């Protein structure tokens, strides 16, 4: 049966599943965001307070890779958590109609905000695959400096700034993702009643 | 938009058509009126666009009754119409109550006819402000001005048109409450000559009218021997 | 731009553009000239034909034995206002047994045309008139405008290419007063000629004249009654 | 936007939006006991300055008919006047007091007059009309559409769904006019955002003796969970 | 859209009627009315910008009947129309029924007139508020206000204008203590409210005060020589 | 509860958090901006009044790296301070409706200027990561002039112009960022009442 | 206080601070534009009437560098003063509404002109950084000519034509920037009243 | 004062200054365009009757450089006096209003046509900088034909085809520029009344 | 004077100058378009039924260069003929107005078809400058096949595919061009009366 299939869908992804994501976001995700941000600052200070030589091209500090992998994990978790809410809203967009679409606009607005949170922030300043970017951009200069070796002094500082600006990028992207998550929380918690039941029939003036 | 009808409000409670109708009065030539101790005197800055028009065309001073005068600034057809309404109001007043209409009452009756045009979608507001002036032994001298919105207030001196600011800044200098009409004529002509700008627009005519003791409650055009004797003083006081 | 599709709408600068656009319909009609001496008032028009093998459109109209008009603009508005004037004059002869003054007719015309400027569902009258008459105050020449405004005039020309006639009249005003009828009609015809190209000139077919005075009712001279008034015009070079 | 226009689904949208103005007014309760009918509503003021003894949400139409509403009071004062006139027309013709159903019909006709023309909006009120005719009580519910419903109990306004389930679970016949007032006040106590005083509500009852708006003393009596 | 013509919105609201409450604050003035045990008082400020105006014509207090007085707040031309209609209704009431109209009834007549403008798209609503005062036979002094939407109610005190919330806070703070209300206490309360919310140190020229009392039920507008008597007593204590 | 989450969101970032940012921008950030601008205009004239050789390719001048780092540390704090106002506004956008959206439009217009501050004036002429591209551009000349070397004079003169242009760009970008900050201050101060509480009032005739 | 932060901004950037810019533009900047066009035409007519050899690749002509530095300084100053006018207008945009937006329209209209002058016309044909671009385009050909270099006959002419096309570019850009400055002057002088108090309209 | 500045501007750039340009365009510029269109086709027909070899790589054809320099001078002279008409129209755009903009529309409509003439049909198919575009490519081919040399003959015919194609480019660009100038002439002559005094203050229905 | 310029410009480009173009297009241009597609199909069938080796990389075919040169000569004439119609219509655009623009719409509608033809469909699938686009690619392949001689077979097959895909391209472009010319013929012949005199003012309702 057709309604049986629609029921099997709407029972697997319910309002409770979408609210379990909002609780976790408001509780732990934001503190993890702020932790990655303070860690990025803690790392950026070290590079700002350091001199680099040819020896620093022979090894990459694991302090930066740890923060980049933490941001990687955070981005992945938030992407899946947001696609859950998207799946909850999108299996309830009702029959297409010229009118009676005052709740459909709500669904499209919240889906647009979630699409923003995904694409405009996670990369799916800097996004999910910043670690690949860092390692490629550095592996260029590490070969240009070793061979034989290049006597360019500005290259040696450009290595240092590759190390620093990525921590800065993390520190800013986390600050922006916090705002986006805090906006999605309000949007859901204010509009959740017409995301589930968008249409409400009044047949009182019929006989 | 919110500025296409007088039946419409804006989110801050403004009706922009009524204001745009005042913008039309701001773009018209200047008329003034001063309440003396024993009468009222009107003066108008009458512009002559072409030399083909006779001396006496586009009269902007109107007799609404045998004790009331009217000066207008804005659209002139609208002013002629409102004069025709101010005439039938005073006519019906005498027909029903048997005596000359007061000016506080005529002003209210015309103000309401003007205000009625600020409420509907089928009509625009009027595009003319105007002053009324009367004298009676009991009611004394009186001067009211009426705006497109339908507001009406009394005055000791007033101006309407382009050089409103410049003219009231000169009228406040006058100690009008001490003087007579023949002495305020000189001042009325002097102000009209001060505020007129020959470069902004071409030559002009001076148009004056009176009501007071010296006319016995009869609104009259000023004679020529006095209008010239005041236009001369206006020229001789421009040495400043 | 978008305060133009209705006459009940002001603009932020304090203007009504439909009235200004109705005034542009007077510039689409042929040119007319009006002028007065101390004894007589004259209207001369230049008639225009649609097809060459048809008759010329009539430009001057009889309203009463002491008033007449020449029209530039829409024909229908002119035909309505003329029928208004005629009945307003008959209504005056019926009651008072006197001819209606011209000032009191043009005041009524203005009062009539003021309504479409203010109430919606009616069009402004897109016709201008030059009104020549004679009453107990002498001769009169009145201009009437689609703006419901009217002027008392020494002389005036309206219609297409009328600035030339106006410029002519503006420098000969000092002569019209003591001019006899022939000279006055000739000044009118020359002011009218100043509106044409250098190719064309005045002709019996395309000139109508209207005269009213003390001892003269409003007469109209159209085709062959005009040739006395044309004889005398200097053959202008360019 | 327009009222003389159907949607392709076949709906009248401005009527649906006029009902949204009823769904946001103050609550109003209605219960039909065996020997009477109760009408109760929330009459709460925005300050201590408002004199509550000057305007009334419970109004009489006749000796034996009375009203409450949810929504707009300006709209209510028109229908009060119209109902009071229609009752007098009926009396003038037949010299009998109008039945409670004919008034509802003739008032829904007035509400329907304002649904068919352009240049007029419908009423932003629903009514509850209590009566006592032919030894039986009556209670109706007129809507802006021009439609009426006879009820045994119902609630209109804010939280009109939970206030109705409360009645479905806490209402039966074999009651009388005093056991029903307690239930109506209990149904209003759900949505009362504060202490319920004698002056924050307004009550009216109908019976064999006719319609009467109770006084603040009688309200304070039963506000103690008494009777 | 749902804001230009008087239609309903999806949330059941009329925005052109809410925008007529915003026109009340365009005049830039504030009115206050207070009720006592034997009196009822209205107060407003009298702001002439020019010395060329006659101050006698610049007023917002009006006499509807000998026993009823008004103060109008909002657009000035709308108020004269509403006042003339109030006078016509008060006169026809007595012509028809043989006794003077109360305030309770005149107020709701004006409100019934105003509601038709919200339910019919012919005419605009009036951007004006109205506060009335009068002495009743059994009920005593009365203070009544009506709105552009057709809402009306009686009050112990109220205000109308820009400083209306910060006036109704002052008033509700003073009303709870329930002192022995009197003529002098009433006028002092009104003037103190208008002084606090404006912070202006009033002159007798900058306000106009209309009063009505059980002794003299005739509405009378006060003189500058009688407002000074109440103003001086304020500076003392 | 849901309202508990809303209120704990809004208690942490209130109006005063944003007024602190605006009051600090009006006082210290502007002064820092003109200071950086004067430093850059002072650095331009030095390189202008200097003939370059190959000795300037074997050494990167500290006096430009300092100005670029100062501009970077300024832009970081400007971004992180603007996100505070963004988070204060975006967690009060009320539930979606087809009307009563005047303050909503105010909110969106005041976000339409903070994004303008963040994107097209901050890099997240030139922006935050000027310091990496300066070095990656100058290295491309330093590796050519040193190798053997290269014998083009235009390359030396381009090294000089590279050192000069990035101080010019800092001066211009500071001149632009001052305008944007001064324009954000006015937009906040003239609209903060509709930013926090956009939808106001519930009138007595609805009952 | 909040309102003090407003006036402490609006008093430092007044109508006088922008009218001074307009006056100096009308007086001296136009003549400077004319002079740079003159010098670019001079150098362009000089290099057309010549014939380059391999010796030319071992020195950059200073007649071109001076002209490009001069245009660079001009464009820098114009950008600064344009941002001054932008700040003056932008600190006075009033609160946000749905109506009474006839002066905000003028504000955004003149800001469009200032943006058009800043972005599309100063590079911030060619704008501010023409000199380094010239130097890159010339360094490529120099290194390709000098090395056992290149036996191409067209490469030498390409160098010769770079050196002239850039003067052509400076000439055209000057001719174009004069027009935009002259347009901004008219816009300001005709709209400065609504650029200060666009919303003086109140009740009466 | 201010009006003195406005009049000093509008007296230096008048309708005469632009009518002179229109007359010169209708007089001599079109004949020069046609002459270039003749010479380009002559050179194209010449190069089609050729047989290229290694000898044609060590010598640039002066016949082509002449035509390209001629087209360059033409484009420059047309641009610099199109800017004259632009300034004429642009120092008369009246003050901003929401009405009475029927001449402002004419002004903008003619400035769009001037934009088409200026920015794309003169390169500010091919435009002003066609000679460098020719010599860069031909040098790129010569450097491989000469060397060790390349023996691919498609390269040798690509030389021929470059030399022919650029003459065809000029032949077509002249044809298009003639039309674009003939359109501006009419657009000016039919509208210079409204391009100069767009608004006319003559309102007789006031007092 | 000015009317002298307008009429001296309009009598030079008349309706006959466009009807002659239409006649020639309907008569001979379409048969030439057919003959080029015929020869391109012949050469395509020739290239398919053959196997390539090193000897093909040492010289180009005389068969394909002819087809491409003929297509080039076609497109040149079609462009130069379209621009005549363009000029005829463009020197008759009347003075700008906010009304009475129903013939101006026809003008701007046929000029859009001419714009779709000349600037875009001639490339001023493939355009006139296709012979160089063929030669550059075939040279890129030849220099790799000849050299060290690349022993990659897919390269030698790509040679054969370059020699066929261009014949295919010409065959398609000729069909598309015939379609567009047949469209322009109808568009001119059904609208030439308002393309010349778009406004008529026999205004009989004025006296």
From TrEMBL, chains A, F, H, I:
<keyword id="KW-0647">Proteasome</keyword>
<dbReference type="InterPro" id="IPR036252">
    <property type="entry name" value="Proteasome_activ_sf"/>
</dbReference>
<dbReference type="InterPro" id="IPR036997">
    <property type="entry name" value="PA28_C_sf"/>
</dbReference>
<feature type="domain" description="Proteasome activator PA28 C-terminal">
    <location>
        <begin position="60"/>
        <end position="120"/>
    </location>
</feature>
<dbReference type="Pfam" id="PF02252">
    <property type="entry name" value="PA28_C"/>
</dbReference>
<dbReference type="GO" id="GO:0008537">
    <property type="term" value="C:proteasome activator complex"/>
</dbReference>
<dbReference type="GO" id="GO:0061136">
    <property type="term" value="P:regulation of proteasomal protein catabolic process"/>
</dbReference>
<dbReference type="InterPro" id="IPR003186">
    <property type="entry name" value="PA28_C"/>
</dbReference>
<dbReference type="GO" id="GO:0006508">
    <property type="term" value="P:proteolysis"/>
</dbReference>
<protein>
    <submittedName>
        <fullName>Proteasome activator protein PA26</fullName>
    </submittedName>
</protein>
UniProtKB/TrEMBL annotation, chain G:
<protein>
    <submittedName>
        <fullName>Proteasome activator protein PA26</fullName>
    </submittedName>
</protein>
<keyword id="KW-0647">Proteasome</keyword>
<dbReference type="GO" id="GO:0008537">
    <property type="term" value="C:proteasome activator complex"/>
</dbReference>
<dbReference type="InterPro" id="IPR036252">
    <property type="entry name" value="Proteasome_activ_sf"/>
</dbReference>
<dbReference type="GO" id="GO:0061136">
    <property type="term" value="P:regulation of proteasomal protein catabolic process"/>
</dbReference>
<feature type="domain" description="Proteasome activator PA28 C-terminal">
    <location>
        <begin position="60"/>
        <end position="120"/>
    </location>
</feature>
<dbReference type="InterPro" id="IPR036997">
    <property type="entry name" value="PA28_C_sf"/>
</dbReference>
<dbReference type="InterPro" id="IPR003186">
    <property type="entry name" value="PA28_C"/>
</dbReference>
<dbReference type="GO" id="GO:0006508">
    <property type="term" value="P:proteolysis"/>
</dbReference>
<dbReference type="Pfam" id="PF02252">
    <property type="entry name" value="PA28_C"/>
</dbReference>
């Amino acid at each position: 049966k057709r309604a049986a299939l629609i029921q099997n869908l709407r029972d697997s992804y319910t309002e409770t599943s979408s609210f379990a994501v909002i609780e976790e976001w408001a509780a732990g995700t934001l503190q993890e965001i702020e932790g990655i941000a303070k860690a990025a600052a803690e790392a950026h200070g070290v590079i700002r307070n350091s001199t680099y030589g040819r020896a620093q091209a022979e090894k990459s500090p694991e302090q930066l890779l740890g923060v980049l992998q933490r941001y990687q994990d955070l981005c992945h978790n938030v992407y899946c958590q947001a696609e859950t809410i998207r799946t909850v809203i999108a299996i309830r967009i009702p029959e297409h109609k010229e009118a009676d679409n005052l709740g459909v606009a709500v669904q499209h607005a919240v889906l647009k905000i979630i699409d923003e949170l995904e694409i405009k922030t996670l990369g799916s300043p800097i996004g999910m695959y910043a670690l690949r970017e860092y390692l490629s951009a550095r592996s260029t200069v590490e070969d240009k400096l070793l061979g034989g070796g290049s006597q360019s002094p500005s290259l040696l500082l450009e290595l240092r700034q590759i190390d620093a600006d990525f921590m800065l990028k993390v520190e800013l992207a986390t600050t922006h993702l916090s705002t986006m998550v805090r906006a999605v929380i309000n949007a859901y918690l204010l509009n959740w009643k017409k995301l589930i039941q968008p249409r409400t029939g009044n047949l009182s003036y019929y006989t | 938009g919110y500025d296409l009808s007088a039946s419409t409000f804006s989110p801050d409670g403004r009706v922009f058509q009524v204001e745009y109708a005042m913008k039309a009065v701001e773009n018209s030539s200047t008329a003034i009126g001063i309440r003396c101790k024993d009468g009222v005197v009107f003066g108008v800055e009458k512009l002559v666009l072409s030399k083909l028009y006779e001396e006496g065309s586009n009269k902007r001073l109107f007799n609404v009754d045998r004790h009331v005068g009217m000066a207008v600034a804005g659209l002139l057809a609208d002013a002629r119409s409102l004069a025709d309404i101010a005439r039938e109001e005073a006519s019906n007043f005498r027909s029903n109550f048997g005596y000359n209409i007061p000016l506080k009452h005529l002003a209210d009756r015309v103000a309401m006819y003007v205000h009625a045009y600020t409420l509907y979608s089928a009509v625009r507001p009027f595009g003319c402000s105007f002053m009324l002036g009367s004298y009676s032994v009991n009611d004394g001298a009186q001067l009211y001005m009426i705006d497109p919105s339908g507001v009406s207030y009394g005055y000791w001196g007033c101006a309407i048109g382009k050089a409103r600011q410049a003219a009231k800044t000169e009228i406040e200098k006058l100690q009008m409450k001490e003087m007579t009409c023949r002495d305020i004529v000189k001042e009325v002509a002097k102000i009209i000559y001060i505020v007129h700008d020959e470069v902004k627009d071409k030559a002009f005519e001076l148009e004056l009218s009176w009501v007071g003791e010296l006319t016995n409650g009869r609104h009259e055009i000023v004679p020529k021997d006095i209008r010239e004797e005041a236009e001369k003083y206006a020229k001789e006081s421009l040495k400043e | 731009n978008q305060y133009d599709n209705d006459v009940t709408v002001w603009s932020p600068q304090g203007r009504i553009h439909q009235i200004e656009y109705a005034m542009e319909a007077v510039k689409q009609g042929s040119a007319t000239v009006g002028l007065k001496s101390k004894t007589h008032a004259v209207l001369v028009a230049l008639k225009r034909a649609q097809s060459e093998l048809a008759a010329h459109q009539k430009k001057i109209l009889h309203v009463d034995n002491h008033i007449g008009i020449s029209i530039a603009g829409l024909t229908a508005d002119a035909r309505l206002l003329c029928n208004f004037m005629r009945q307003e004059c008959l209504d005056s002869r019926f009651v008072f047994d006197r001819p209606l003054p011209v000032s009191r007719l043009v005041s009524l015309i203005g009062s009539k045309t003021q309504i479409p400027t203010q109430r919606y569902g009616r069009r402004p009258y897109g016709v201008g008139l030059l009104i020549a008459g004679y009453d107990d105050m002498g001769p009169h020449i009145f201009q009437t405008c689609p703006s419901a405004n009217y002027f008392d005039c020494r002389a005036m020309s309206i219609g297409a290419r009328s600035q030339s006639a106006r410029t002519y009249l503006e420098r000969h005003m000092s002569e019209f007063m003591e001019c006899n009828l022939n000279e006055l009609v000739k000044h009118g015809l020359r002011a009218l000629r100043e509106t044409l190209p250098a190719e064309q000139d005045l002709t019996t077919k395309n000139v109508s004249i209207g005269i009213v005075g003390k001892d003269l009712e409003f007469t109209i001279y159209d085709d062959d009654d005009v040739s006395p008034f044309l004889e005398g015009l200097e053959e202008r070079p360019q | 936007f327009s009222l003389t226009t159907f949607s392709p689904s076949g709906k009248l949208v401005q009527i649906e939006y006029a009902l949204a103005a009823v769904a946001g007014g103050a609550p109003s309760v209605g219960i039909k006991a065996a020997n009477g009918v109760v009408l109760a509503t929330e009459k709460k003021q925005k300050s201590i300055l408002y004199d509550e003894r000057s305007v009334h949400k419970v109004e009489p139409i006749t000796k034996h008919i009375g009203l409450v509403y949810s929504g707009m009071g300006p709209d209510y004062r028109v229908l009060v006047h119209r109902a009071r006139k229609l009752a007098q027309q009926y009396y003038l013709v037949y010299q009998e007091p109008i039945p409670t159903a004919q008034l509802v019909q003739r008032v829904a006709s007035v509400m329907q007059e304002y649904t068919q023309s352009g240049g007029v909006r419908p009423f932003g009120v629903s009514l509850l009309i209590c009566g006592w005719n032919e030894g039986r009580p009556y209670l109706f519910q007129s809507d802006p559409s021009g439609a009426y419903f006879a009820w045994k109990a119902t609630a209109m306004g804010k939280n009109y769904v939970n206030g109705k389930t409360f009645l479905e679970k806490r209402y039966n016949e074999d009651l009388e006019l005093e056991d029903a007032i307690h239930t109506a006040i209990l149904t209003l106590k759900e949505s009362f955002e504060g202490q319920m005083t004698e002056d924050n509500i307004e009550v009216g009852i109908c019976n064999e003796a006719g319609f009467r708006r109770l006084t603040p003393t009688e309200v304070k009596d039963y506000l103690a969970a008494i009777a | 859209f749902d804001r230009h013509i008087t239609i309903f919105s999806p949330e059941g609201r009329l925005y052109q009627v809410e925008y007529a409450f915003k026109a009340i604050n365009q005049g830039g003035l504030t009115s206050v009315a207070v009720r006592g045990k034997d009196c009822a008082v209205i107060v407003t400020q009298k702001k002439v910008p020019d010395k060329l105006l006659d101050s006698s014509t610049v007023t917002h207090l009006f006499k509807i009947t000998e026993n009823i007085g008004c103060v109008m707040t909002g657009m000035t031309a709308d108020s004269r129309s509403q006042v003339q209609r109030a006078r016509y209704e008060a006169a026809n009431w007595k012509y028809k029924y043989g006794y003077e109209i109360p305030v309770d009834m005149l107020c709701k007549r004006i409100a019934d007139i105003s509601q038709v403008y919200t339910q019919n798209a012919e005419m605009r609503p009036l951007g004006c508020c109205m506060i009335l005062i009068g002495i009743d036979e059994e009920q005593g002094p009365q203070v009544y206000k009506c709105d552009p939407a057709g809402y009306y109610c009686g009050f112990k005190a109220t205000a109308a204008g820009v400083k209306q919330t910060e006036s109704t806070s002052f008033l509700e703070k003073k009303v709870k203590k329930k002192f022995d209300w009197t003529f002098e206490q009433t006028v002092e309360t009104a003037i103190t409210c208008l002084s606090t919310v404006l912070s202006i140190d009033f002159k007798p020229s900058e306000i106009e005060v209309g009063v009505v009392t059980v002794e003299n039920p005739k509405f009378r507008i006060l003189t500058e020589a009688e407002i000074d008597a109440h103003l001086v007593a304020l500076a003392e204590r």
